[PDB]
Design a protein around this motif. Sequence first.
Motif, PDB file in Angstrom:
ATOM      1  N   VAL A 150      35.940  64.629  60.930  1.00 54.71           N
ATOM      2  CA  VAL A 150      36.765  63.826  59.987  1.00 54.71           C
ATOM      3  C   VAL A 150      35.870  63.134  58.957  1.00 54.71           C
ATOM      4  N   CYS A 151      36.189  63.275  57.699  1.00 51.95           N
ATOM      5  CA  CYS A 151      35.376  62.606  56.647  1.00 51.95           C
ATOM      6  C   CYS A 151      36.134  61.370  56.163  1.00 51.95           C
ATOM      7  N   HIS A 156      39.159  54.922  45.086  1.00 54.98           N
ATOM      8  CA  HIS A 156      39.455  53.777  44.179  1.00 54.98           C
ATOM      9  C   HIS A 156      40.316  54.256  43.006  1.00 54.98           C
ATOM     10  N   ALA A 157      41.098  53.377  42.436  1.00 58.52           N
ATOM     11  CA  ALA A 157      41.971  53.773  41.297  1.00 58.52           C
ATOM     12  C   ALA A 157      41.124  54.416  40.193  1.00 58.52           C
ATOM     13  N   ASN A 158      39.869  54.075  40.117  1.00 57.98           N
ATOM     14  CA  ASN A 158      38.997  54.670  39.061  1.00 57.98           C
ATOM     15  C   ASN A 158      38.145  55.783  39.668  1.00 57.98           C
ATOM     16  N   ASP A 159      37.906  55.727  40.951  1.00 63.49           N
ATOM     17  CA  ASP A 159      37.067  56.770  41.604  1.00 63.49           C
ATOM     18  C   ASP A 159      37.848  58.083  41.698  1.00 63.49           C
ATOM     19  N   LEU A 160      37.205  59.189  41.434  1.00 60.81           N
ATOM     20  CA  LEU A 160      37.908  60.499  41.529  1.00 60.81           C
ATOM     21  C   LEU A 160      37.963  60.922  43.000  1.00 60.81           C
ATOM     22  N   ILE A 161      39.023  61.563  43.414  1.00 61.29           N
ATOM     23  CA  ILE A 161      39.119  61.987  44.840  1.00 61.29           C
ATOM     24  C   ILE A 161      39.307  63.506  44.924  1.00 61.29           C
ATOM     25  N   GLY A 162      38.723  64.125  45.913  1.00 60.58           N
ATOM     26  CA  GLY A 162      38.869  65.603  46.068  1.00 60.58           C
ATOM     27  C   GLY A 162      38.047  66.070  47.273  1.00 60.58           C
ATOM     28  N   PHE A 163      37.989  67.352  47.512  1.00 64.38           N
ATOM     29  CA  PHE A 163      37.195  67.856  48.669  1.00 64.38           C
ATOM     30  C   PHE A 163      37.029  69.374  48.562  1.00 64.38           C
ATOM     31  N   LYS A 164      36.184  69.947  49.380  1.00 65.95           N
ATOM     32  CA  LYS A 164      35.972  71.421  49.322  1.00 65.95           C
ATOM     33  C   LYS A 164      35.636  71.957  50.718  1.00 65.95           C
ATOM     34  N   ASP A 203      48.086  49.444  47.315  1.00 69.09           N
ATOM     35  CA  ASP A 203      48.675  49.891  48.611  1.00 69.09           C
ATOM     36  C   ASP A 203      47.570  50.391  49.545  1.00 69.09           C
ATOM     37  N   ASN A 204      47.786  50.302  50.830  1.00 64.69           N
ATOM     38  CA  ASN A 204      46.760  50.776  51.804  1.00 64.69           C
ATOM     39  C   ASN A 204      47.145  52.173  52.295  1.00 64.69           C
ATOM     40  N   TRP A 205      47.766  52.957  51.456  1.00 64.33           N
ATOM     41  CA  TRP A 205      48.195  54.318  51.890  1.00 64.33           C
ATOM     42  C   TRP A 205      46.978  55.197  52.182  1.00 64.33           C
ATOM     43  N   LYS A 206      47.134  56.138  53.075  1.00 61.89           N
ATOM     44  CA  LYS A 206      46.012  57.053  53.422  1.00 61.89           C
ATOM     45  C   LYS A 206      46.545  58.491  53.474  1.00 61.89           C
ATOM     46  N   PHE A 207      45.697  59.462  53.293  1.00 67.34           N
ATOM     47  CA  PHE A 207      46.165  60.879  53.337  1.00 67.34           C
ATOM     48  C   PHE A 207      44.983  61.782  53.694  1.00 67.34           C
ATOM     49  N   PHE A 208      45.232  62.960  54.203  1.00 64.62           N
ATOM     50  CA  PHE A 208      44.085  63.844  54.571  1.00 64.62           C
ATOM     51  C   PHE A 208      44.464  65.328  54.480  1.00 64.62           C
ATOM     52  N   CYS A 209      43.473  66.171  54.303  1.00 61.68           N
ATOM     53  CA  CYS A 209      43.713  67.641  54.217  1.00 61.68           C
ATOM     54  C   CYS A 209      42.905  68.315  55.330  1.00 61.68           C
ATOM     55  N   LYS A 267      36.277  75.560  64.859  1.00 56.77           N
ATOM     56  CA  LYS A 267      36.370  74.069  64.808  1.00 56.77           C
ATOM     57  C   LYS A 267      37.154  73.659  63.554  1.00 56.77           C
ATOM     58  N   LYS A 268      38.093  72.761  63.690  1.00 54.78           N
ATOM     59  CA  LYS A 268      38.900  72.339  62.506  1.00 54.78           C
ATOM     60  C   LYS A 268      38.177  71.228  61.734  1.00 54.78           C
ATOM     61  N   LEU A 269      38.278  71.246  60.428  1.00 58.12           N
ATOM     62  CA  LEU A 269      37.611  70.198  59.600  1.00 58.12           C
ATOM     63  C   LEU A 269      38.682  69.307  58.958  1.00 58.12           C
ATOM     64  N   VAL A 270      38.618  68.021  59.169  1.00 60.82           N
ATOM     65  CA  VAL A 270      39.651  67.117  58.575  1.00 60.82           C
ATOM     66  C   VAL A 270      39.046  66.268  57.449  1.00 60.82           C
ATOM     67  N   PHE A 271      39.703  66.231  56.319  1.00 56.84           N
ATOM     68  CA  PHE A 271      39.212  65.414  55.171  1.00 56.84           C
ATOM     69  C   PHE A 271      40.170  64.230  54.990  1.00 56.84           C
ATOM     70  N   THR A 272      39.697  63.010  55.083  1.00 60.93           N
ATOM     71  CA  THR A 272      40.637  61.861  54.943  1.00 60.93           C
ATOM     72  C   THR A 272      40.052  60.743  54.072  1.00 60.93           C
ATOM     73  N   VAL A 273      40.896  60.104  53.303  1.00 62.71           N
ATOM     74  CA  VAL A 273      40.451  58.974  52.435  1.00 62.71           C
ATOM     75  C   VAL A 273      41.486  57.847  52.545  1.00 62.71           C
ATOM     76  N   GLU A 274      41.122  56.639  52.205  1.00 65.48           N
ATOM     77  CA  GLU A 274      42.101  55.517  52.309  1.00 65.48           C
ATOM     78  C   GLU A 274      42.057  54.661  51.040  1.00 65.48           C
ATOM     79  N   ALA A 275      43.162  54.060  50.685  1.00 65.45           N
ATOM     80  CA  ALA A 275      43.191  53.204  49.463  1.00 65.45           C
ATOM     81  C   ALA A 275      44.396  52.262  49.533  1.00 65.45           C
TER      82      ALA A 275
END
Length: 127
Positions: A37-38, A43-51, A105-111, A119-127
């Motif tokens: 899990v990552c 942040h509202a200004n920080d870009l979010i993504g993953f690969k 908001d403290n919403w969170k989401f993951f891919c 092995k499964k790889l989980v990507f998660t961020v919070e804001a």
Amino acid sequence: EKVKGCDFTTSESTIFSKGYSINEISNKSSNNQQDIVCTVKAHANDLIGFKCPSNYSVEPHDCFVSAFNLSGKNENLENKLKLTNIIMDHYNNTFYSRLPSLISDNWKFFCVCSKDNEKKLVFTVEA
């Protein structure tokens, strides 16, 4: 600047600020033993993504365009947050989204990325 995201294909992602090595995902896992899990802070200004590596399959467990919410229900995340400049590249298995300039908001989401017997790889961020 660098893009906030987890790279399961390169420990040193010249694009994502967080990356893991093929070994760490086999030994120094994130929290559990195999599930990787990552956890990162967006942040509202920080870009979010993953690969994810080209040998793995990309499946949205809780992404933003379409995914399963924390309740495990499939619902678009646009009604929750109006993301802009959405980029979805399945060939390179990389996703990027721009966060508004304000987010209290403290919403969170993951891919997630995975394959049979793998092995499964989980990507998660919070804001």
